Ligand binder design. Structure first.
Ligand SMILES: Nc1ncnc2c1ncn2[C@@H]1O[C@H](COP(=O)(O)OP(=O)(O)OP(=O)(O)O)[C@@H](O)[C@H]1O
Ligand SMILES: Nc1ncnc2c1ncn2[C@@H]1O[C@H](COP(=O)(O)OP(=O)(O)OP(=O)(O)O)[C@@H](O)[C@H]1O
Ligand SMILES: Nc1ncnc2c1ncn2[C@@H]1O[C@H](COP(=O)(O)OP(=O)(O)OP(=O)(O)O)[C@@H](O)[C@H]1O
Ligand SMILES: Nc1ncnc2c1ncn2[C@@H]1O[C@H](COP(=O)(O)OP(=O)(O)OP(=O)(O)O)[C@@H](O)[C@H]1O
Ligand SMILES: NC(=O)NCCC[C@H](N)C(=O)O
Ligand SMILES: NC(=O)NCCC[C@H](N)C(=O)O
Ligand SMILES: NC(=O)NCCC[C@H](N)C(=O)O
Ligand SMILES: NC(=O)NCCC[C@H](N)C(=O)O
Ligand SMILES: N[C@@H](CC(=O)O)C(=O)O
Ligand SMILES: N[C@@H](CC(=O)O)C(=O)O
Ligand SMILES: N[C@@H](CC(=O)O)C(=O)O
Ligand SMILES: N[C@@H](CC(=O)O)C(=O)O
Lengths: 386, 386, 386, 386
């Protein structure tokens, strides 16, 4: 038996690699993806071999991540429960996709991940796996073993020769998530120094910085006049937004499995992109189109959050969003200053704005007719009330 | 003939007062509302009499404004096209409501206002008027007179003893709007020193300020432990938020009459309230209720923006929002710093958050069944696609 | 140990009654609800004591069923996937509500039901049970036992001395559902003579029959001038409609648990009510209110179908629907003829219909201005495409 | 000046033709479109040149109508206010399209239509025109002339030698609309014998008739195994459905211009197509995709109704609806009888239905886990309510 493990290189997944070998008497093929966690994935691939993997695979998936997952999601203007830009949410489907493919190539009947049974990650990995390969077998050790606590897990690791180095983290090219431990008390502010991707706003530059982001048919293609590939572009904006402490959010969210959870997120580059996109859309999108799009975004957001990425409902909404986004071509100019992002300008080759219609053709007399007709049903309602 | 004029006290409404008397051979009853514009309404009242009004009325409507218009709107989480907190939008219905009441008390067949034929305010005023009193006659001089240019307007005023004096402004307790003039170029950043209600972030304190806002059944009732009436509470938050320069937005919006317009807004207190409310809701609102509520907010927002306040659609949705909002009871803790409003904590008497559900009753294995069932239709789809 | 069982008096819930006694060795309180199945619940209550119940309770819940479940649901215009009027769906919550109530009165720690593991009913009973009493224990024999066939169940029945006898049925005052067996082939028309509640249209009266339904504030209060209580009213309309073979539906629906199921339903009285309501709503509901209401109806429907009756989202939506329904006061006149229901007239004390508005409410130029303004954005769009 | 007139051939439109030659002293180009009104457009054409047209054009647009307008709309499941299948609505855009093309070809400056200022048709013609050619000049005689009363128009008619004679009618391949006159009283059943396209139910065949419709990627391509072009197919279904009295609707609808109107419609072929499509969708569309689509259908419906065919909102939604409809391939089997349409069967080469999922990837214990997780938030809620 062969099992393809999503190996992040940490303590828990290393414990899982061991546990899988013994419990299933299986050959474990470790897969580590580089999606911008800021870590030498090759080191995790070597640790996996030391830990007992019969084979270790590491891939640079940053470009595929931004191009095929992050960009499509952003076109939708996806925001979960008012703030979450879904940094972890869109990354999981990608990893699950490669697990299934690798499982297919290696003749492995199962795949494994180390997401716990009380989070959303388990759902994203499995819904993806099942949607792509219906009869694949999935093993989630956190839902199968019986370790009674951290202590017991540390002992198991030590006993297996696994190095055993106040909150949990998940990092990638889009954001860094923080939750658990000290963060579990929603009345407690996150501890000073926790943030890594963004600079403390209190330590940000004393001078604001301007940045321009160009969009072509829905996707950002340039920063300050320099054309950059999807992954290189997100990275550049993370650097620029990061230095100024942009993109910090603190929320108590609703997990798909039913309980509320306190999460803290930093999405410097994505936050700039959120406002840059809406800035360009403000010149290129039609009013009714915009309003309809915004009322569907939330639904799309929960689909991503819940894990329905490779799902027909999400693909269907995607058809709508992509259609709408094709008109998003132009440039957004933003001003960054101590944690904040300010839109200060925007332009587009096919802008729908006409100073013609606001400055003092158009006939004010038309407005009276418009108002009279719009008011008809209201007046009838009033007359009936009497 | 008696005409009740919404009289702001400026040059144009003064010109209008004179214009109405002669054009309609009628007496004009001027009505100036104090909704927090930051001016002495008694001075407008006195000027109205000097300009020729047979009667001038001035009322302090700050409490009614915040209590009966601002709060109900905020409960719905109303946000127009991603950023506009509707500062001017919710104030107009209030004014028109009084215009119609005064017309009935005075025996006036008509009411008048000085909103132009190319803006949104004309619609708000008229839809309100017609909704409350369907047989009311409305007179909008901008859509009726023959003035050709601003120069002829000054001459007309000077000739009538009316005193004569970059962008246009509208200020009240909720915000200050800036549009027109140099702002008409969407690529140009607004001019330095334009903002009045908020201090530039560059000048804001280097020390962040923590602020707590208590919510009771959907409405903010206290700030930092001090109970404040609606208007006094908004005022307080405008002061605290204003000093830190919070609540500035720069957008190109879609007017109801059809054209795009570049608008700049500062809503210090309202912006704090927006995030404070969501912070309390994150503990007091059920997941599914929240998601539904958020998908209806944009619709309610456009209704307010278009002027359908005293309209059945709006009141129907208000029934939904008010039902939901009633559960919003608790305290939000925010950190204000150079333009930003950061949520750092939240608590509630009946919080739905359970640390025992995230900490490491609930059974991991239940999750497997959940996922399997959730995945069935996706697996069937995959098998059919063969 | 005590266990309150939702006992319908049939072969399986009887088998289940025996099974529970042997499996748990607990006293089993049988509960049988009269919701219009057209059965003598006293016979079931005696067969229960006969079968082994330590106590058998039978309650007439017809009025509560229609008044507190069917009517509130109908005010929302609830329709699942185009045709299902949710006859079985709104019934289960009522039953579960009593099971929990009894268990609390009898000091029983657990409740049980005979819904299978492949359907929706299991979810409805349980979500209702847990929502009302969070720590109540639920037992679902179909998910726990070992019978591997019908033959084994019958054998087990005789072995225990229980009376033993092409599709499954569920009947109550709202409808009769038929699914399973022969119906599992979606290309196969249901068998002749299957329907019980409605008379085959080809054997229905040759002369159409007219019926008038009076609505008051959202609920039907009279039929052909006769004031009838909720249950008596639904009953009366089942008679009138059944006679004509009205309300037959055949669909392949999506169960909440993942798979498609072929269902056939007969809802005579409810189908008349569906159309009578809309007829009265056509004169009493504002255009925008209706349009918004209709876009929410489908959501409320799936909530009812999935089993989220005693859930915050449904109750929140209910506040919106009840608010709108309050205006639905008037009379609908329908024509019934061989399986079909035809609206032929409607009137209302506060009808918003005005013949003077259509006869040959505004000036002609008014419509021109309305059109010009509505067209503005389309013309700008065209010009930009230049 | 040249004026292209959408000329139907009736009394009113012939008068308009004279009025235009006389009032404007312009060279009138008549345009009659054959869209299945059941009339020799060649006659209308000759009656035009006769009446005074400097030219008359008649075009057979039946195929374009069904293929480019009716099908895309049906693909969306468009239904206005619960019953209206939009027969007249989707036709107007087609006519205005050619009106504008002809005017461009004939170098005309204006176009004219005979829709009154009280209805929706004026909006449909004009929004379409402006959207296609923003500079187009539009003339609506009903809004510009001075006739008061039917008598006057007759006089002016008999004066120029034009042929002169209970309700108004509009017919095309999709339906026949009846409104006005005796129909204006909502409580008054339509007059016996009014219907033309549909045989009266009471005089419909004594034996039911079965019919099958094949769909390929969203559109019906055959009837009873016979492949038929869009128009030929709608024609055939009109014949079959017509003989049985299928597709009659009687409603009080809300016009875009503000007032309620009592309309009666007969859409035999279209009604069969509506139920056939949903029958094929029941096997070919995913649950969540279907539920989302249905919540959007009503919006698309009002778009069509209001006249926003060639509008960005509609085209954006069309992308979603077309994406979803591409999966709709299969066959629906319906039973027609005495005015009703009963779905009795359906099949699809890629059906998502699996009998093995319902008959006695799916395990028992799974349902329990699903239920528990789904119930969590409800349990927490109850607990908090103590
Ligand atoms: N870069 C990666 N490559 C492959 N799989 C990954 C990667 N990052 C995360 N995963 C998968 O996602 C699952 C993990 O979650 P999380 O990111 O919450 O895991 P951990 O890193 O295992 O635990 P923690 O940091 O909370 O102690 C992992 O157990 C692993 O299977
Ligand atoms: N505080 C107020 N009290 C009464 N009416 C008001 C008030 N503020 C605005 N209005 C009404 O709204 C209409 C105005 O618009 P806007 O607010 O755009 O006017 P202005 O151009 O600011 O003022 P003015 O017309 O005096 O020069 C006014 O002409 C007036 O009729
Ligand atoms: N009238 C009723 N009173 C109480 N519980 C009922 C009633 N009707 C249905 N139920 C509950 O719903 C569950 C049943 O389902 P269904 O209606 O699918 O059962 P059956 O299998 O058709 O009938 P039976 O098992 O009694 O022969 C039952 O096992 C029972 O717990
Ligand atoms: N077959 C057609 N070809 C071209 N234009 C048409 C056609 N049918 C209708 N129209 C256009 O649509 C507008 C009409 O409406 P309707 O179809 O309601 O008009 P009528 O036929 O003019 O009036 P009536 O109610 O008396 O029959 C017409 O005035 C005409 O300009
Ligand atoms: N530290 C973590 O394990 N966080 C992973 C991201 C969790 C986040 N609440 C999400 O659902 O996407
Ligand atoms: N300065 C102004 O006249 N602005 C008034 C508010 C206009 C704003 N765009 C609104 O529509 O509410
Ligand atoms: N015979 C049955 O057990 N049917 C009960 C109704 C099932 C229906 N499909 C529902 O889900 O409500
Ligand atoms: N007879 C008519 O003139 N009817 C034209 C169609 C009217 C229909 N109520 C519609 O709005 O489409
Ligand atoms: N990654 C965490 C959190 C989550 O999945 O939501 C876990 O595995 O539980
Ligand atoms: N107050 C401005 C702007 C607006 O009403 O939208 C006007 O009268 O035009
Ligand atoms: N009553 C059937 C069908 C359903 O519940 O949906 C069962 O118990 O499976
Ligand atoms: N065709 C009719 C009705 C409508 O347009 O709605 C008219 O011209 O008024």
């Amino acid at each position: 038996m062969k099992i393809v493990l999503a190996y992040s290189g940490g303590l828990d997944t290393s414990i899982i690699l061991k546990w899988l070998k013994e419990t299933y008497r299986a050959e474990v093929i470790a897969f580590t993806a580089d999606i911008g966690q800021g870590e030498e994935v090759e080191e995790a691939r070597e640790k996996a071999l030391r830990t007992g993997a019969s084979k270790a695979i590491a891939l640079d998936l940053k470009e595929e991540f931004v191009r095929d997952f992050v960009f499509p999601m952003m076109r939708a203007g996806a925001v979960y429960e008012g703030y979450y830009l879904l940094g972890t949410s869109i990354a999981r489907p990608l990893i699950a996709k490669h697990l299934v493919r690798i499982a297919e190539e290696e003749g492995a009947e199962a795949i494994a991940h180390g997401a716990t049974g009380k989070g959303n990650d388990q759902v994203r990995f499995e819904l993806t796996a099942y949607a792509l390969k219906p009869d694949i077998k999935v093993i989630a050790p956190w839902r199968e073993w019986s370790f009674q606590g951290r202590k017991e897990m540390i002992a198991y690791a030590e006993a297996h020769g696994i190095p055993v180095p106040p909150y949990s983290m998940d990092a990638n090219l889009l954001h860094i998530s923080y939750e658990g431990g000290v963060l579990e008390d929603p009345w407690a502010e996150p501890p000073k120094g926790m943030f890594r991707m963004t600079q403390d706003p209190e330590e940000a530059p004393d001078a604001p910085e301007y940045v321009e982001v160009e969009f072509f048919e829905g996707d950002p293609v340039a920063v300050n006049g320099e054309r950059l590939s999807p992954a290189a572009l997100l990275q550049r904006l993370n650097e620029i937004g990061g230095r100024h402490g942009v993109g910090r959010v603190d929320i108590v969210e609703n997990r798909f499995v039913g309980m509320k959870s306190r999460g803290v997120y930093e999405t410097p580059g994505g936050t700039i992109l959120y406002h840059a996109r809406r800035a360009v859309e403000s010149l290129t999108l039609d009013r009714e189109v915009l309003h309809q799009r915004d009322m569907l975004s939330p639904k799309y957001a929960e689909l991503v959050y819940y894990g329905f990425w490779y799902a027909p409902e999400r693909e269907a909404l995607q058809a709508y969003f992509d259609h709408v986004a094709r008109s998003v071509t132009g440039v957004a100019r933003l001003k960054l200053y101590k944690g904040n992002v300010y839109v200060v300008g925007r332009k587009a080759p096919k802008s729908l704005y006409r100073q013609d219609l606001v400055s003092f053709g158009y006939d004010q007399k038309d407005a009276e007719g418009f108002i009279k007709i719009q008011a008809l049903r209201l007046r009838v309602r009033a007359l009936v009330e009497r």
